[PDB]
Amino acid sequence: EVETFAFQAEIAQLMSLIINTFYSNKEIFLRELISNSSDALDKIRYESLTDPSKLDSGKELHINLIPNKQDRTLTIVDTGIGMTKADLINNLGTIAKSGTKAFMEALQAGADISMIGQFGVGFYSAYLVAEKVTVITKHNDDEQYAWESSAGGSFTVRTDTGEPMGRGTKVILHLKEDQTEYLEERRIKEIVKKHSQFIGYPITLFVE
Numbered sequence: 719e720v721e722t723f724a725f726q727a728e729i730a731q732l733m734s735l736i737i738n739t740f741y742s743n744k745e746i747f748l749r750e751l752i753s754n755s756s757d758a759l760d761k762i763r764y765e766s767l768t769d770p771s772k773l774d775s776g777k778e779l780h781i782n783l784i785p786n787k788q789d790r791t792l793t794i795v796d797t798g799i800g801m802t803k804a805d806l807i808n809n810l811g812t813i814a815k816s817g818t819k820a821f822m823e824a825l826q827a828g829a830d831i832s833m834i835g836q837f838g839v840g841f842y843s844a845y846l847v848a849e850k851v852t853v854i855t856k857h858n859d860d861e862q863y864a865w866e867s868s869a870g871g872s873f874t875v876r877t878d879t880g881e882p883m884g885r886g887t888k889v890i891l892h893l894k895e896d897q898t899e900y901l902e903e904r905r906i907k908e909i910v911k912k913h914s915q916f917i918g919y920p921i922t923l924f925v926e
């Protein structure tokens with residue numbers, strides 16, 4: 719049911735660096751995940767122009783943010799193109815290798831963590847706040863999968879037994895104890911306004 723994999727070394731290093739660097743401007747993680755969601759929504763929207771049956775797994779194109787204080791989780795849901803098994807195990811990490819490498823050179827040369835997105839690797843900024851990240855994702859061409867990592871050099875992928883999601887990606891951030899401010903309605907709004915106000919899809923905050 720469950721396979722465990724090692725991160726590429728460079729990504730495993732970016733991850734320790736993100737978990738072990740004192741860096742207080744942690745809010746930018748939301749911006750980056752909303753930005754990944756937006757690119758995924760662009761992609762399915764574009765593909766649907768030539769093949770409208772790609773939207774048979776769901777027409778609405780949106781981002782839901784879903785704080786949950788009792789679980790200490792923040793879930794970002796998009797109805798973008800989703801990820802295949804190859805994407806999760808291989809292809810995205812292969813792509814992220816070069817940008818991770820540049821990003822770390824850039825940090826050594828004075829850049830700061832907030833520029834992570836310009837290297838295509840903003841996803842791993844989740845680890846500024848999350849001790850564990852679960853990604854549930856469904857691409858039209860594939861089954862539903864659950865990726866998960868608490869960093870420390872590995873991640874698992876398994877096919878996902880739970881509720882079907884149709885098409886898309888759900889990123890479930892298990893927050894560090896000291897990061898629970900990112901579960902507050904006001905704080906999330908503030909972040910979204912400040913950082914994500916030009917995203918061309920509806921972002922809905924789910925209030926508890």
Ligand SMILES: O/N=C(\c1cccnc1)c1ccc(O)cc1O
Pocket residue numbers: 751754755757758796798799800801810841886887889
């Ligand atoms: O396809 N779904 C993706 C994705 C995959 C490849 C490039 N950009 C976004 C995705 C990845 C991370 C994330 O937080 C949300 C997403 O929808």
